[PDB]
């Protein structure tokens, strides 16, 4: 485009009080409406979230798994 | 004031409002075939009837010609007829033998010359004046349809010196 040699009317970054107030009211209304759809949400939600686990690039994941298995064996022996 | 626009549950919404028997339909079909036109009788209140089951069907040639185009396209798609992927090899001919082709060419040439003579028998010209468009205005025809919509009896007035000329079919 010929933007450099012939720029157009600038897009003002100066806000107006009316628009700021309207945007604040709309944001509050959206937050309340989202709370309302959340309290009447019929979508299924799991009791326990899917836990990501241990990263592979962690260098001591193998000994941490050894610790987990040892803790399970100790708990089974105690119980 | 904004009302509560609610529809109650009712068994009447799921039933048939109007039913008709086959004997009644056949009697109505016989009446439909037997009916004639009398100018000295007028229609006062139409009977609510299932006319699609009572009036006769379309004619044979009409029923075929309304579906000839769709039938030809279903038989041969546009892409198989002409184009880069076309598979059409033998054309469709109205003749079968060489003698029939010669006779067909003779009749085709005669008909083409007849059409050319008819068209010949039938500096640019000036535009038609807008005075001759009078009586065809959208405002005038809005008025006409308003009067028709509001009237029960319509008197169509004819000049006695040119009745079919002034008649509005």
């Amino acid at each position: 485009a010929g933007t450099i040699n012939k720029p157009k009317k600038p897009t003002s970054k100066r806000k107006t009080t009316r628009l700021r107030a309207k945007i604040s009211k709309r944001a509050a209304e959206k937050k309340r409406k989202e709370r309302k759809l959340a309290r009447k949400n019929p979508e299924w939600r799991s009791k326990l979230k899917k836990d990501p686990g241990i990263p592979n690039l962690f260098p001591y994941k193998e000994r941490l798994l050894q610790q987990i298995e040892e803790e399970r064996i100790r708990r089974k022996e105690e119980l | 004031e904004v009302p509560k626009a609610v529809i109650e549950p009712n068994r009447k919404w799921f039933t048939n409002t109007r039913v008709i028997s086959q004997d009644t339909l056949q009697s109505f079909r016989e009446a439909m075939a037997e009916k004639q036109k009398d100018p000295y009788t007028v229609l006062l209140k139409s009977n609510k009837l299932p006319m699609s089951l009572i009036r006769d069907g379309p004619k044979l040639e009409d029923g075929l010609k309304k579906h000839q185009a769709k039938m030809t396209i279903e038989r041969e798609p546009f892409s198989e007829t002409f184009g880069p992927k076309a598979q059409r090899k033998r054309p469709k001919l109205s003749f079968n033998t060489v003698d029939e082709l010669a006779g067909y060419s003779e009749q085709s040439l005669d008909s083409y010359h007849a059409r050319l003579e008819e068209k010949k028998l039938l500096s640019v010209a000036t535009a038609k004046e807008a005075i001759f468009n009078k009586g065809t205005s959208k405002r005038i025809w809005n008025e006409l349809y308003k009067v028709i919509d509001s009237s029960d009896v319509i008197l169509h007035v004819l000049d006695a010196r040119d009745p079919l000329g002034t008649r509005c079919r």
Binding site: - | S123, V124, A125, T126
Partner: protein
């Protein structure tokens, strides 16, 4: 090719749109009523106008009835508004007159009554061939 001829020097245009000029050929028309001028530019409120040697579009107001329902091309061959040639001569004819042609410039009639202008005769060779007097 549009009807405006090339190589024409500027002259005074004496015949605007709405002028009635005489018909100088034996096509059957007696007068030509100018409705448009070929090569006329665009200007607000300005009437298109033509001079000697210009092609205009005209309707026939008096003449044979077959000519009355068409828009004919015509070439102006005489004008009464005085104009100057390049040799310094200001001149005018005693009437405004034109001849009916086709878009390619050939005449509809077969003879021209009265003289024609040098501009018209030089721009249109058929008018030059059918002109008895060139002034």
């Amino acid at each position: 090719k549009r009807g405006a001829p090339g190589g024409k020097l500027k002259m005074t245009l004496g015949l605007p749109v709405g002028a009635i000029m005489n018909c100088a050929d034996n096509s059957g028309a007696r007068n030509l009523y100018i409705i448009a001028v070929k090569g006329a530019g665009a200007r607000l409120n300005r009437l298109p106008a033509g001079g000697v040697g210009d092609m205009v579009m005209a309707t026939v107001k008096k003449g044979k009835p077959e000519l009355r329902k068409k828009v004919h091309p015509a070439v102006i061959v005489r004008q009464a508004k005085p104009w100057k040639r390049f040799d310094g001569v200001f001149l005018y004819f005693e009437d405004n007159a034109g001849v009916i042609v086709n878009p390619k410039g050939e005449m509809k009639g077969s003879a021209i009554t009265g003289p024609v202008g040098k501009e018209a005769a030089e721009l249109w060779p058929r008018i030059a061939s059918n002109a008895g007097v060139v002034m």
